[PDB]
Structure formats: structure tokens, C-alpha cells
């Protein structure tokens with residue numbers, strides 16, 4: 001740890017503080033994540049240690065590379081490759097004119113590649129969001145904090161008591177499914193996709209029930225017809241209001257039919273009907289995908 005020199009705090013993270021230190025040996029600039037853990041009264045669980053050690057191997061161009069895991073002093077530090085911008089900041093900077101469709105499509109395509117990879121390794125993200133997607137000057141976008149959920153967990157509030165966003169949570173998670181699948185990442189990515197297109201969060205709930213109900217008001221309250229087994233879910237209430245489904249043309253204009261079609265499949269209620277990352281990659285929406293360069297101001 002003495003091998004690193006912090007240059008500036010860049011994030012409060014969900015597990016701990018994220019610094020932009022420099023490696024004193026190699027001289028590289030990196031993203032240092034400090035996961036708080038005691039020594040005796042706690043001390044990093046062996047389990048998490050082996051989990052994280054498996055993520056060090058999960059290398060893909062669309063996944064932020066985990067350079068190292070330092071456990072010294074009985075504490076946990078994660079050293080990640082550094083990026084200058086996350087998608088949230090980029091969308092905020094592109095709010096006035098909107099991110100060009102070609103770039104939106106490129107990012108969606110790359111992220112699906114990243115997910116296809118992780119998912120083929122039985123590793124799910126669980127908490128995809130704009131702030132966790134990082135981009136560079138070359139037009140690449142990468143999944144960040146991948147696997148750190150299963151490793152540790154996803155708390156309601158971060159160490160800074162900051163509330164965790166529910167906007168991208170799949171319905172099965174909200175309904176209490178304890179053993180959800182890779183389909184949850186596809187849902188989150190679908191929500192992000194819509195947001196890049198419309199320049200407004202698709203389902204900005206501020207509570208679990210508000211999130212669920214916002215989803216219901218748009219996609220219609222799910223029932224046994226569109227989601228077999230939904231009424232038997234841990235948190236499903238027969239008393240849920242019954243809202244009728246809305247047209248996608250009204251949800252993401254002016255996205256073309258191919259994008260709307262693809263989005264509809266990424267937002268299917270039934271996790272088993274929801275399109276997989278691999279299948280999504282073959283969607284007609286991507287027949288003319290390219291890799292534009294974004295206009296980034298670092």
C-alpha cells in the first residue's frame with residue numbers, strides 16, 4: 001500500500017473510497033478502491049478473497065481490468081485500470097444534444113459483448129448503472145465493479161450512507177427472487193440503453209415499491225400470463241395495482257423499430273424470456289454497428 005501515492009479522491013463507492021493514486025514502482029495511474037475491513041473483530045473473509053481472486057482472471061476488453069488485490073494490514077485494496085470518464089458524466093455532458101445514435105449503439109454493443117463474456121463464465125454484475133460504465137477517448141466502454149457484488153454484497157447505503165440507486169434493478173430482484181440470473185444485467189443494460197436514447201432515466205424510483213410500480217405503470221403489472229410464477233414470488237402482493245402496458249413508441253422515441261424491438265426483449269418481465277447478451281449481439285439493430293469516437297473533455 002505504501003507503493004501507492006493518492007493523487008485525488010474520485011468516488012465514495014459502494015464498498016469504500018475510490019482514489020486516483022499512482023504506482024510508485026511502475027509509475028502507472030490507477031483507480032484504488034479501499035474496502036474497509038478490520039483485522040481481528042473482522043478481517044477480510046477468506047471466501048471473498050477467493051472470489052476476488054477469480055475476478056483478476058476475468059479479462060476482457062469491455063471489462064475494467066483488475067490489476068491487483070492487496071490484503072496487507074488485514075485490509076482490502078483493489079487496484080483497477082484508470083479511466084477518465086464514466087457514462088453518467090458523459091450523458092450529463094451530452095444532455096443538450098444527446099449522444100449520437102451510432103455511439104449509443106456502439107456502447108450497447110460493447111457492453112453486451114462484455115456481458116456475454118462474464119455470463120459465459122457464470123459471473124453476473126448485479127448492479128449495472130451509468131456510474132459503473134467507464135469510457136475512454138478511443139470509443140471503448142467497460143463494465144466496472146464486475147463481480148464485487150457476489151464477492152461482498154450490495155448494501156442499501158454506502159459507507160458514506162449514500163443511498164444505492166434502484167433505477168436499474170430487475171423486477172425479479174425487487175420481487176424477492178433470491179436466486180436471480182444473468183438476466184438481471186440485461187435488464188439493467190436495457191434501462192441504460194433507454195436512458196442514453198431519451199436523456200432521462202427510464203424508471204427513476206426512489207424506493208423499492210416506487211421502483212416496482214414505475215416499472216408496472218410502463219410495462220404493465222405482470223401476471224401469470226406474461227410471467228409464469230410471478231404471483232408466487234416472495235414479495236409479490238395480489239393487492240398490487242393492475243396497470244395496463246404502454247406502447248414502446250411512447251417510451252423511447254425516436255428510437256427506430258430495431259432498437260425498440262431489441263429494448264423490448266431486454267425488458268421482458270420473465271427472466272427466461274428476456275434476451276441473452278449473446279442473442280442480443282445478433283439482433284438486427286447491430287447490423288450497421290460502428291465504433292465512433294466520443295467528444296470527451298477530460
Ligand SMILES: NS(=O)(=O)c1ccc(Nc2cn3cc(C(=O)c4c(Cl)cccc4Cl)ccc3n2)cc1
Nearest residue numbers: 013031033080081082083084085086089132144145
Ligand atoms: N466523474 S468522471 O466521469 O470524471 C470519472 C469517473 C471515473 C474515473 N476513474 C476511474 C474510476 N474507476 C473506477 C473503477 C471501479 O471498479 C469502481 C469502483 Cl472501485 C467503485 C465504484 C465504481 C467503479 Cl466503477 C475502475 C476503473 C476506474 N477508473 C475518473 C473520472
